Amino acid sequence: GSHMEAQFFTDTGQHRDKNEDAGGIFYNQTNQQLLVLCDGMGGHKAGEVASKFVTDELKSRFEAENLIEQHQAENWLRNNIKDINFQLYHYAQENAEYKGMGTTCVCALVFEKSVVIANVGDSRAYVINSRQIEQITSDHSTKVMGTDKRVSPDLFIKRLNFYDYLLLNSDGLTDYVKDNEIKRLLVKEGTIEDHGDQLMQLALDNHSKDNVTFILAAIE
């Protein structure tokens, strides 16, 4: 039943026709929480097919699980990301309008005092408090799911103590909003919707040329 107060935000942006970002907040049979964010691309403008494909697979597989304790989480994420990459790759190869499509994926399994994060691509995971903002993941840039039948995701475990927020985001945010801008926005008093709306408007005010998507989660 480990979960944070969290919300998913996305915007096509003022310089894009479609939204090829995807993601969500999902719950398994014991109401554990999984945060998922995907930045799609490629194919004949089929980026949204890839990002939604991975998001839907993670949701379906997670909702089918009973209990994933912290010591099982790295292997669960790693093996399921590998399997989803395999499925997406061959799906793309079997459809001429999809061939070449792929997507980033950053996702987080939530536990009591920790989070387990898997990452493929240049979407990001951050933890933030009043004095620092730490990018947990490392941009693979760009390796994405679905363009090869093999993938090697990075796995991270981060203790949530003494941090205030967990942030997952596509590059539409951090390509145009600096880390310190994000941290100083979050140090203010306000709800998740307060910070989420302000952070989206800030990305738009910086004239992001990309889809902008993020999950903001409050750490107790």
Is 56 annotated to bind a ligand? Reply is no
207: left (phi over 0), alpha (psi -120 to 50) or beta: left
**Cβ-based nearer residue to Mg ion, 68 or 216:** 216
120 touching Mg ion, by CB under 5 A: no
> For Mg ion, what does the binding mask look like between residues 171 and 200, x meaning CB under 5 A?
xx----------------------------
Is 171 annotated to bind a ligand? Reply is yes
CB of residue 38 vs Mg ion: minimum separation in angstroms? 9
Cβ proximity of 117 and 156 under 8 Å: yes
Stretch that binds Mg ion, among 40-48, 92-100, 105-113, 160-168 (CB under 5 A): 40-48
The number of helix segments (H) and strand segments (E) in the chain equals 5, 11
**Cβ-based nearer residue to Mg ion, 11 or 39:** 39
Site for Mg ion in 148-167 (CB under 5 A): none
* CA–centroid distance for 109 within its chain: 11
Is 194 annotated to bind a ligand? Reply is no
Q: What is the DSSP annotation of 182-197?
A: HHHHHTSS--HHHHHH
| Residue from 81, 122, 127, 212 binding Mg ion (CB under 5 A) | 122
Which tokens go with 191? 């709800």
Cβ proximity of 38 and 8 under 8 Å: no
Residue 204, number of CB atoms within 10 A of its CB: 15
Stretch that binds Mg ion, among 17-25, 77-85, 89-97, 126-134 (CB under 5 A): 17-25
Is 197 annotated to bind a ligand? Reply is no
**113, 3, 9, 104 alpha-carbon torsion, rounded to 10°:** 70
Is 139 annotated to bind a ligand? Reply is no
Please compute, for residue 127, the number of CA atoms within 13 A of its CA located in the half-sphere on the CB side: 18
| Residue from 210, 213, 216, 219 binding Mg ion (CB under 5 A) | 210
Tell me which residue has its CB nearest to Mg ion: 171
Which residues of the shown chain bind Mg ion in the complex (CB under 5 A)?
20, 39, 41, 47, 122, 170-172, 210
